[PDB]
């Protein structure tokens, strides 16, 4: 059988690691997301539309290099690229723009160029910040605080490149929506030999948390100038992905090098070999057993329904999410069931890539008027985009997660739903 | 410590030391025996059903009032003994009694009505005075059927034709008592709605020195089909004449609960014995706090790894039920149900929220006790208009009688299922509701 | 062979999980290997005649209780007397000769807050009368231990203290109560009176959980087998008591009233070894011995390092033996508390410690009577073949059996060191 | 005792996790690495390292096993090749704090079955007495059983490492394994043979398989390949060596890097500073029970106290195993169970000293004094040879605790003892 179900059926991680299969095809969607940089050799809207084919979910803009009218130009081209797609609404794909910005360059502090495209951020609708060069929680305070009121809605995803990152880890991971393992500046800040310890730990810790960790820099660096990687770059690709990253990303292989597109198709393929590789049995066990009591009912919800999905092996769990919280937690147990999200929140669609596994539907059908009818055709649209898209099959099982009223944060429903 | 931090915050330490909860948390096997604490005191309700034969000695109305209030659950009527006429007077003694707290869904408590056959004899098969006493069963309403000296599935078959097309939706719990009953079980268990460990014959069949281990592997494939499973006999001998039991009777009565009964029951401490109360009272004590020692922590575990995978939604529901309960130390799980099953398939994971079934069956209601952890609830109102509705009021009535009846408290939450559309079978919906 | 993967409940030993080793379980997989649980049997009335002892030591009774709270010192004199009159008729034959340890329980305490005038004349009866076990009645802290300790003097130096915990304090007091215990005795009739009858089981499996956390002897007693005090055969609630004592951990299980006063005293023994052989091939030793290595803390004791290396040995090829020099006894106890399914012969020349390790489970004492051979290599091998000629004798080993030898790497105790594998020829 | 600082070092606090999630989180870049490097460092010697002086360097940056490419070169450029590794290792037998055995390993040109250039080439190292061969593109029993007949009469005592190079001898793999010594993931050629996205599955496969038989296994190929040119290795390639140990591999491996770059010393110390921290990091808590769990029962002896002392290692947290072996299988065996305790393995052999090498964890030390008439004097004359090299190298203390592992006997076969020795 497929997707490595045999491997995934065994009682020990050594009998699992001996079951993997080179013949056992990957069947499920990719679920890690790809973040490339947007530069020079990626600019172009039509090398934009073969990037999001490709299976690029984030554009990221390196603040360290161009200029803001430089940034904005890439912007609108990602844009347009990404609307191109939007004749087909049950098969279009959001993605989202990340800014990486340039960092204190000296001083603790936040610059005021940082100042200044934080500001750019804001009037230019960016999703993320990649803050870079976070060495306390006040660091990030400072981001936020230079985000203003209009970009309260801004993910920040702190970038731990140097010593001091690592060791107040917890204290930044506590006030960030996310962490980059940003493995340049890190293994020039710390002996290069122990960059693969900090990656793996603030992995885990990420895990833990049920917050995105982006695996960052050289995953793919030969292929700047060769179309085909080293065998040290698959494997470095697909160890992040059984690490339990949620993003890998491209920076060079897709801001100036020849082969941008063939650098996205490489860690599509590789991630989605890598995904179906994962030991779930392992793997929940352990994430159910440290995952602490809650009496939140999103949380409650949410690992009743991974349970309720492992059960049945169920095709999808569709749930419904305003700001994609709830889609957050149930990635956090890490389903082998894809999370189909819909949402109306074009902002939250974009950000749901953050958390792995998550497959973003924007919702843009006229209202139901009663409320329970309209969460109905919701559920029935997550349903019918599963099913274009290949993820669903009429006899399958789905799970279901709801709400009980309008508005974020009462999602308390699960329901075994059969597939037409 | 970090997986228990924040509830320790909001529920408090005190909340954490009773009903074994530092053995519950335990790591291993061997640490939650070393955290097994006699100050750790059981607070939910007892979720093992005591099983009493009714006899001489707890015959009259009076009598099995004061049973009821110390908590059993299902009657048995031994058709070794008395007659016909002598039987039907208990039945309808137990009736008088049980319909006594029928005022109100606060005091009512559904028995179950357990008739248990004289047996095969030297025979092979199907006697004809059993034949004659399954028939009095049905005329009389009897919920359940012990059938005594089942050993082979062709016996519990030969009993579900004597039963008739009346008897349909009689339980028929086969008796394993000697050696031919424990090779053939897998076969019994297959075609029998559940199994109750006779000890009495079979410690005379087998080697009395090896019941224990047919005890514990029928407990433990009952537990895995999710079929009920009865202790039985002599498990207070001891209180037939005295008032306390010896220290080998009370290790007995927990030890058959942690090794997984769903019932335990009283047959000459009951029906022949000086402390009939007593002995009820004692096998009530002693299950509360041996369902508290349970480590749930490898059960839920170990019945996730052996269970099948299933495309049952009823099953499907219920295990992620029993998971968001453990999340969340749910105090209740409410269910509708009309046959009993969807309460069934939640007591199979063993959960340590009471199951709280909500049904219009007064046969079913009495039929529950069979399994662990099933409170149910009879409900008498007339069916709303809108469907929606009526299980909108059905849910209301469990939380609402939970309430008064301690089972539940403003700020808990409570884990609720649900079907998608009437009738049994389609359970489906899981919800996580905060009391208010 | 695929018979020898039938027997003693192989198959559910073999399980991936508790669950499915408890539906493994079959009543037709016979018991091959010995007893490994002590039978304590109270002596009185009912058993105190000579040729009486010799078929309760035939029927498996591996230590005799005297119970101090009844007879004179001239009674328990005579009943020390009989018991070693019984045990020597067989020392004519050494391979097969079986060593019985002497215990004497105290009365206790009674209204006052620690030890007894009495109890410190019956203690001094005891080093007198060479007993090897103390059963120190209600226990209610660590200084009454050493009160007892301080009344069995300088020449009661080797004689165990085992704790008997009968109430609350006792139970509450525990961790440092078994800190400076030999072992402990769950004392259930007491303890069934202090504190309430429903709650004992939780006291049992707690106590018996830490003894085994803490490698000491736990003993399991009274009213295991109460209704063959006057009757032939134990009720359904009985035999279920004394085999979940065992499936528990205890090390040792007791007789009182059945041994000392009723009319079935061989019997209660025959019964109580019939249920306990079933008991312990029904234990699941893959959850055990994992949970034993996974508890037990790092050590840098050569004693302890050894025991376990061997133990794993042991489990590795199936051993039917692990041989062991010692001379207090502490090299089979740190055998013993890893729970091998392989039973521990303990070769040792102090017959003192030949009926001390009785309080540890799977532990067989052989008492060797040879004196020193000159070359101390040869006395030690000497000493491995008499374990060896014992074992084949006893039906433990056969030709072809694989066996774990613990040795130390100089004479006098402390210096087990040392782990063999041997192949019986 | 041992101290508050000794288990702060060597990702002890990560080691004693009860999971393998919480093992994660517990890594610390911090805690530094004290044990020796475990995972052997095989380097092929070509053009870049080839000289006696650049050799000498490479031993010291930690090269176990020189590599020879039989692809290249010719016989005559081989054999100057081994006579300089051989040259560069005597040069240290004057001292042994730095004497180190390097095993010699021919990596053949490769294929229908076995070439005609590949017999006069497997010839060519039975005459000049390599170690290790590493078979290119074995895809099937019958290939093994080529190479082991036309290592001819002399060489029977060469260990044969398949290399996996392609879809069938992935796909035959099982048979494979059963008649090598040991299996070389031939990244570079399987990265073509099979589409690129999967040779991690192979690898991890391989590893686990080679791990659960007790067989050594090397990672090949492109580890990092960056530093052919570059001082420094790449993130991705960092990454990769750690994993390679992580995931079980007994030996590392580097082609260009060593063969034809700008930076061969460089690379290998690189490998080596990588695979001691990677070592560390070993969550041998779930590691050691899964070793256990599907190991089956043996009645072999040598198989039964191995177990026992790698048990008994990890009880009292040993230093070492001292493990008196002929052939290098007592050492093998007691590899197979991952030890965080160093086998230093004592022997009379040169051939196995440098074959254990392929084992992860074997420190070898060749033993060459006389034999003594008693033969237990000899046996403790080796035992403390062991010891003396331990304190003498760092790896042991005085009031330390070792495992020694003995036979009952003289010869090969007949291991059945383990003792818990003091150091004094
Ligand atoms: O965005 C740019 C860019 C923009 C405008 C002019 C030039 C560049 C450029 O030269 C560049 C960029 C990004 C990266 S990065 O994302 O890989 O770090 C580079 O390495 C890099 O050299
Ligand atoms: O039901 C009866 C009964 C009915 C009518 C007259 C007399 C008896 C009676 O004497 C009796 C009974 C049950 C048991 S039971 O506990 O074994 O089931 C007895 O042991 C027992 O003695
Ligand atoms: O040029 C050589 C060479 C030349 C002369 C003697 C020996 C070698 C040699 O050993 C070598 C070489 C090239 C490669 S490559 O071209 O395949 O990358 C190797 O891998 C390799 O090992
Ligand atoms: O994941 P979030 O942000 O909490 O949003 C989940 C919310 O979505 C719903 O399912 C549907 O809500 P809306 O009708 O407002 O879209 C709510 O019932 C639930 O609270
Ligand atoms: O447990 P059972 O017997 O399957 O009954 C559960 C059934 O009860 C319900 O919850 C309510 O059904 P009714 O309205 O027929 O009483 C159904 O939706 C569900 O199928
Ligand atoms: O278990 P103990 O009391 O420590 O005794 C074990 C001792 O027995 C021996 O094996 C043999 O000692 P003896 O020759 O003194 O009997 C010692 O090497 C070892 O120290
Ligand atoms: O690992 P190998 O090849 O089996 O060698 C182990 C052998 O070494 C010894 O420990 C010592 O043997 P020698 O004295 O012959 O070297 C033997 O007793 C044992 O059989
Ligand atoms: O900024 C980054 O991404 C880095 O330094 O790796
Ligand atoms: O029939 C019974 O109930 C018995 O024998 O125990
Ligand atoms: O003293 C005892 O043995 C008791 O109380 O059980
Ligand atoms: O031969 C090799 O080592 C390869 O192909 O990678
Ligand atoms: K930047
Ligand atoms: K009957
Ligand atoms: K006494
Ligand atoms: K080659
Ligand atoms: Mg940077
Ligand atoms: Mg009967
Ligand atoms: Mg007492
Ligand atoms: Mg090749």
């Known amino acids: 059988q497929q997707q490595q179900l045999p491997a995934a059926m065994a009682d020990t991680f050594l009998e699992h690691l001996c079951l993997l299969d080179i013949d056992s095809e990957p069947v499920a969607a990719r679920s890690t997301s790809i973040i490339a940089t947007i530069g020079p050799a990626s600019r172009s809207v039509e090398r934009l539309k073969e990037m999001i084919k490709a299976g690029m979910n984030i554009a990221r803009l390196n603040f360290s290099h161009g200029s ?107 006030v960030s929506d996310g962490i980059m393992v940003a493995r340049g500046d890190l293994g020039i800040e710390i002996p290069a030999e122990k960059v693969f310890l900090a990656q793996k730990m603030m992995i885990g810790r990420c895990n833990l948390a049920g917050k995105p960790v982006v695996c960052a820099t050289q995953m793919l660096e030969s292929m700047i100038t060769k179309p085909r990687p080293t065998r040290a770059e698959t494997s470095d690709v697909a160890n992040a992905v059984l690490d339990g990253a949620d993003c890998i990303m491209l920076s060079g292989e897709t801001a100036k090098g020849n082969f941008p597109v063939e650098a996205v198709k490489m860690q599509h393929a590789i991630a989605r070999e890598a995904e179906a590789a994962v030991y779930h049995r392992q793997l929940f066990e352990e994430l159910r057993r440290a995952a602490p009591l809650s009496r939140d009912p999103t949380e409650v919800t949410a690992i009743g329904a991974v349970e309720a999905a492992f059960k049945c092996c169920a095709a999808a769990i569709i749930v419904l999410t305003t700001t994609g919280r709830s889609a957050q937690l149930l990635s956090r147990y890490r389903p082998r069931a894809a999370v189909i999200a819909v949402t109306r929140s074009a902002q939250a669609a974009r950000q749901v890539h953050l958390c792995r596994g998550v497959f973003p539907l924007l919702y843009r059908e006229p209202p139901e008027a009663i409320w329970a009818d309209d969460v109905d055709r919701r559920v029935q649209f997550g349903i019918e985009s599963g099913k274009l898209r290949g993820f669903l099959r009429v006899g399958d099982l789905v799970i279901v997660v709801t709400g009980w009223r309008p508005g974020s944060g009462y999602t308390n429903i699960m329901r075994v739903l059969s597939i037409s």
């Not at 200044?116 to 976070?134: N, Q």
């Open 68 to 174: 803001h009218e430089y940034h904005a130009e890439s912007i609108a081209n990602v844009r347009e690229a990404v609307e191109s797609f939007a004749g087909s609404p049950l098969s279009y794909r959001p993605v989202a723009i990340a800014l990486d910005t340039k960092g204190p360059g000296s001083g603790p502090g936040l610059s005021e160029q940082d100042v200044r495209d934080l500001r750019f951020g804001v009037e230019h609708g960016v999703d993320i910040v990649f803050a870079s060069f976070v060495r306390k929680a006040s660091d990030v305070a400072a981001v936020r605080a230079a985000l203003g009121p209009e970009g309260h809605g801004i993910k920040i995803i702190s970038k731990i490149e140097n010593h001091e990152g690592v060791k107040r880890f917890d204290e930044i991971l506590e």
